[PDB]
Design a protein around this ligand. Structure first.
Ligand SMILES: [Zn+2]
Ligand SMILES: [Zn+2]
Length: 1174
């Protein structure tokens, strides 16, 4: 209970370790008495072994008081201690015969098979009593008596030969005399042939019968002469022969005990040195099988674990409370399957003792041992071999393997989650009147949620004197407690979350406000992040308790601090669907509106101007001014545009100054919502515009400003969405009757052309092309009507013009997370000069469309200067959007920017290489777990040329349809075989021509225009449109290029669906694929870390393979291939440093990211001496 450890080591549990764990051997397969329902002595649940059922009470009760702690009762053998030990103490079962641990024997690849060099099929026949095996052979005695045995054996083989030849002549003698005697008597020719045919077969059968024994004897002599330990005999009559004669030279057995003997007479070191020598002689299958086999042999040599652990002499029994036997409510009983699996083991084990003691033919005994062997396999991993053990209803029993994994739908649930106190949920309803940092909380829910809190305040203010009175006071919902609730709730944040949780914005903090009703009121702007429809969705509420937790909610997870998508940097809390149309209408400009500005001439002065913005309101309330009119007024509090601001002042400003411009009264009221410092906009507030303006604000103003500014756009957006006058009815939804009639000629002409196609006037391609012209004619016709058909001021069009309008992908996101979770910023700067080139909106006489996801939010590796001229931007600059335009003037077409691919940080990555945090808009903060955020940023749209191609890339699999890349630079010769293509590259060396043999015409050539014969080609160009083998480009272009390629492919898929993911997210995932280099040979094994590293090569491997290769063994176990990881980890005897965050989550430690880093969890908070005086 120290809560802070360092390592976690695993190793094969020996028979002694098991005996040391156990608190007593369970001897009987008895659960509990059928009458008293008390635990039966010496059986499962035995209180003597595992512990008491009641705290400080022995079984008989002689010592039933709270005293006598840790004293064993001399009548029932029960220790006097808390009943909790009934969940910590184990038992054991002493096996009358050894047994194999199914994990090391059957788990692929066979650990025992590779350890003793026995094929798995052969090994299976040994442990399950299908064939004998030679344990020991005495050479010297055999060699000395070899002569006599040979002589005696020859005599025997001859005696058979003398008999065989002597028998055949007798039958032939009879037939010779018999057939002739029958021939003497009148008989048909066929009769003689039948007898002779029978006689010939009779002889044939007789010689072959003697030949059989000759081959048998020969096999006996050969098998004896070449007898050697580890040999296997399946005949069982041959073996019987070897025992009756020559029985003193050799020894053989079956089952686990023979396997145990071979391990006893086994020299790892002796063997370990032979196989090390064996690797050099024959390269191929022999050395390969030796290479694989040595890994296990070396693991046993380096570690102190005895390979004897693979065969158990004792079996551990899990505590009872984890396999509990419980009396169900309603009279029935329920119990774990382990008890029936343990029952099989102990039942058969005891019967064996019986059989052994009685003395029984080996068949009966061996049959019992095999049964015992199988019962332990079922106990550990049921069904792993043969038909699984089934109970009633033919359902397989839950083995230990199943319950550790979760093989019966338990693992998923463990990472499906664990439940938590101080929580609740309910259906959500819209909260249009809430501030962004607030949420509506049903009073009842907030009551039960804060129950403990309001209880203390209810007692302190002496409404009730004792705590018991406070509990009943809240339980009965006394009217006095509602005043104490607002006091405990004040400035106490809560966490809202809606499943499924895709990105980190799926959980946010809010200021709880007590509300009437049983529904949660959610702010309307956060619907985007939660993907929360109001069709009846429910949301969960959690209550942060500790100071650190509350602070994390106020600072890290607060609603108004998280506005920008942590994937694209785009704003999410930006208005949508209602406020868009409302703001669109407010700012729109209508010609000839009431009060329209008119520059009156020669009879009166202009009538469109107005004294101040307030006056226009009085003209709008009266019928004088339409908010959407083109009037002009003089504003004294808004800031003028940039271009017009220079002409007017250029030296001072207009906090109290005035100025005139012509805009809609609405466009005025709109700009009032923005900050005072922001320049006037004066535009129809299109959907796209609001994104621009909101983006700009995030860069120029703090968060609180944008939060309050978006709050003001919500109110205005809604208010004018109601006065918008947008409703559906018969007229608007009506589809034009003329469109249906015009298509009749459209459909008759497309069909009339089909009647001419059959006649022979079709011309076979123009006809098909002409039909498209007909079909295209209707498309043109609908456009000819569409805007003219429905009045420009149509509410359906206005909604369009304004812009207002599963687990398979989450399966991929899980592998993404598990491969990148340990990637966190660990230092501000690694100081590396390396970087990568960005195209930066090239091809101009023109900005690249993908600059926002490749160049935005980066940092320069080298200064950017435009020659001839001054340096445009200094290295290490943030490369904001304003910087791009400044860079655009210089005419630059490439930029070097730092990246996590080139970062040299020993641990994790550095801030400067990572760059700007998408959520904060500033430099990324040390400790940010950019890996998890990256996996989410990629996984979320996964549910949204699709997921198979993306999964094909991240898993590093050979492309579905392979496409060749250029192996060397030079010109290209193109040839066309029948149904094939040949592509020869004539190098500029010019050396050996590179020929790409056979290429399906179905997978046509790539494009520059389309490639032709004789074009120049570089060292990495893709020759045909398709997916190039990532392992191919790796060996060709090197690690730095494979990353550039993969990112280009992944981002192209997401770009195809209109998803904006910044490259750095994808890069974080790719970086983890090239971290290891294969050695396998100057070193023992391949795939050591690049930093860990006698020549090795750069390696490309999938996320699933890369994540399973992590140094933590319990992280790889909770991920995939559970049984496999433990077996290899137990053998190697690995120790986990508990460095990654997954591990700490399991044991309950602080994750080494965010508020858990060393630098951040050791802050000392003391008040300055200067402040205390006050
Ligand atoms: Zn007792
Ligand atoms: Zn770096």
């Amino acid at each position: 209970d120290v809560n802070f450890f360092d390592e976690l080591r695993i190793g094969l549990a020996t028979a002694d370790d098991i005996r040391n764990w156990s608190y007593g051997e369970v001897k009987k397969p008895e659960t509990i008495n059928y009458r008293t329902l008390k635990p039966e002595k010496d059986g499962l649940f035995c209180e003597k072994i595992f512990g008491p059922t009641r705290d400080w009470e022995c079984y008989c009760g002689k010592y039933k008081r709270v005293r006598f702690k840790g004293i064993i009762c001399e009548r029932c053998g029960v220790e006097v201690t808390r009943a909790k030990v009934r969940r910590e103490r184990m038992g054991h079962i002493e096996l009358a015969a050894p047994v194999t641990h199914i994990w090391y024997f059957k788990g692929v690849p066979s650990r025992l098979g590779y350890l003793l060099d026995l094929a798995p099929k052969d090994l299976e026949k040994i442990i399950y009593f299908a064939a004998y095996v030679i344990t020991s052979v005495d050479d010297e005695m055999r060699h000395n008596e070899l002569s006599t045995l040979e002589a005696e054996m020859a005599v025997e083989k001859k005696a058979v030969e003398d008999q065989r030849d002597a028998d055949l002549e007798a039958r032939a003698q009879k037939l010779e005399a018999d057939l002739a005697e029958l021939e003497a008597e009148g008989a048909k020719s066929d009769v003689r042939r039948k007898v002779r045919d029978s006689g010939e077969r009779e002889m044939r059968q007789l010689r072959d019968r003697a030949q059989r024994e000759l081959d048998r004897l020969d096999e006996i002599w050969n098998t004896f002469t070449k007898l050697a330990p580890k040999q296997l005999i399946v005949d069982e009559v041959l073996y019987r022969e070897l025992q009756d004669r020559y029985g003193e030279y050799f020894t053989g057995a079956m089952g686990a005990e023979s396997i145990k003997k071979l391990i006893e007479n086994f020299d790892i070191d002796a063997e370990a040195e032979s196989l090390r020598e064996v690797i050099r002689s024959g390269k191929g299958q022999k050395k390969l099988r030796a290479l694989k086999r040595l890994k296990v042999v070396a693991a046993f040599q380096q570690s102190g674990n005895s390979p004897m652990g693979m065969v158990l002499d004792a079996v551990p029994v899990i505590p009872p409370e984890l396999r509990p036997m419980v009396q169900l409510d309603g009279g029935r009983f329920a119990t774990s399957d382990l008890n029936d699996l343990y029952r099989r083991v102990i039942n058969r084990n005891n019967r064996l003792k019986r059989l052994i003691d009685l003395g029984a033919p080996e068949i009966i005994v061996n049959n019992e041992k095999r049964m015992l062997q199988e019962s332990v396999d079922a106990l550990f991993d049921n069904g792993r071999r043969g038909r699984p053990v089934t109970g009633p209803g033919n359902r397989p029993l839950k083995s230990l393997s199943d319950l550790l994994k979760g093989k019966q739908g338990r693992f998923r649930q463990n990472l499906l989650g664990k439940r938590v106190d101080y929580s609740g949920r309910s259906v959500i309803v819209v909260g249009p009147q809430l501030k962004l940092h607030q949420c509506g909380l049903p009073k009842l829910m907030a009551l039960e949620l804060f129950k403990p809190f309001v209880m203390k305040r209810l007692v302190d203010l002496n409404h009730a004197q004792n705590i018991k009175s406070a509990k009943r006071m809240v339980e009965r919902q006394r009217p006095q407690v509602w005043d104490v609730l607002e006091e405990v709730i004040a400035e106490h944040p809560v966490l809202l979350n809606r499943a499924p949780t895709l990105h980190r914005l799926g959980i946010q903090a809010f200021e709880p406000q007590l509300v009437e009703g049983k529904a949660i009121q959610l702010h309307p702007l956060v619907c985007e992040a939660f993907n929360a429809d109001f069709d009846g969705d429910q949301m969960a509420v959690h209550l942060p308790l500790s100071a650190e937790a509350q602070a994390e909610a106020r600072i890290l997870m607060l609603s108004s601090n998280n506005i920008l998508s942590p994937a694209s940097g785009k704003p999410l809390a930006m208005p949508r669907l209602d406020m868009v149309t409302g703001l669109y209408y407010l700012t729109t400009l209508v010609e000839g509106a009431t009060g329209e500005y008119q520059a009156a001439t020669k009879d009166a002065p202009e009538q469109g101007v107005y004294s101040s913005p307030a006056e226009a309101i009085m003209a709008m309330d009266r019928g004088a001014l339409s908010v959407r009119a083109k009037i002009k007024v003089r504003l004294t509090e808004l800031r003028p545009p940039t271009d017009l601001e220079a002409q007017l002042f250029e030296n001072g400003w207009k906090p109290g100054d005035a100025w005139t411009a012509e805009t809609t009264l609405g466009r005025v009221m709109f700009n009032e919502l923005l900050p005072k410092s922001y320049p006037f906009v004066n535009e129809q507030m299109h959907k796209k515009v609001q994104a621009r303006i909101i983006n700009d604000l995030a860069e120029r103003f703090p968060m609180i400003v944008v939060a309050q500014t978006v709050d003001k756009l919500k109110d205005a957006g809604f208010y004018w969405a109601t006065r918008s006058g947008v409703t559906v009815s018969m007229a608007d939804v009506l589809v034009p009757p003329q469109k249906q009639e015009i298509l009749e000629r459209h459909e008759a002409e497309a069909d009339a052309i089909e009647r001419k196609y059959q006649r022979g006037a079709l011309n076979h391609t123009e006809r098909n092309e002409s039909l498209v012209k007909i079909w295209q004619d209707a498309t043109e016709e609908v456009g000819k009507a569409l805007e003219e058909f429905y009045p420009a001021d149509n509410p359906i069009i206005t909604i369009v013009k304004s812009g207002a309008t599963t687990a398979d992908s989450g399966y991929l996101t899980r592998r993404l997370v598990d491969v990148s979770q340990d990637v966190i910023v660990r230092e501000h700067d690694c100081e590396t000069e390396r970087g990568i080139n960005v195209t930066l909106a090239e091809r101009g006489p023109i900005r690249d469309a993908h600059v926002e996801t490749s160049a935005f939010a980066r940092t320069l590796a080298t200064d950017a200067v435009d020659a001839n001229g001054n340096v445009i931007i200094e290295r290490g600059h943030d490369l904001g959007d304003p910087a791009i335009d400044a860079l655009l003037a210089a005419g630059i077409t490439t930029v070097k920017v730092r990246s996590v691919l080139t970062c040299t940080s020993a641990t994790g990555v550095c801030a400067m290489c990572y760059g700007r945090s998408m959520a904060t808009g500033k430099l990324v903060d040390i400790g940010e777990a950019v890996g998890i955020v990256a996996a989410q940023s990629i996984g979320e749209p996964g549910t949204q040329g699709g997921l198979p191609r993306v999964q094909e890339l991240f898993e590093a699999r050979v492309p579905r349809n392979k496409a060749p890349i250029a192996d060397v630079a030079g010109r290209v010769r193109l040839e066309e075989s029948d149904k094939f293509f040949k592509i020869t590259i004539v190098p500029d060396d010019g050396g050996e021509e590179v020929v790409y043999d056979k290429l399906s015409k179905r997978q046509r050539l790539r494009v520059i225009g389309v490639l032709s014969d004789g074009d120049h080609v570089e060292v990495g160009d893709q020759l045909m449109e398709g997916a190039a083998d990532p392992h191919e480009v790796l060996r060709v272009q090197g690690p730095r290029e494979v990353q550039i390629h993969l990112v280009k492919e992944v981002q192209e898929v997401y770009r195809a669906q209109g998803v904006s993911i910044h490259d750095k997210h994808i890069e974080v995932i790719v970086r983890q694929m090239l971290r290891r280099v294969t050695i396998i040979d100057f070193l023992p094994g391949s795939l050591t870390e690049r930093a860990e590293f006698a020549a090795g090569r750069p390696v490309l491997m999938g996320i699933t393979k890369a994540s399973l290769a992590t140094d933590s063994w319990l992280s790889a176990a909770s991920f995939q291939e559970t049984t496999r990881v433990l077996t290899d980890a137990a053998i190697n005897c690995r120790s986990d440093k508990l460095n990654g965050l997954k591990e700490n989550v399991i044991i309950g430690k602080l994750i080494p990211a965010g508020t858990g880093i060393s630098r951040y969890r050791n802050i000392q908070v003391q008040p300055t001496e200067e402040a205390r005086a006050a």
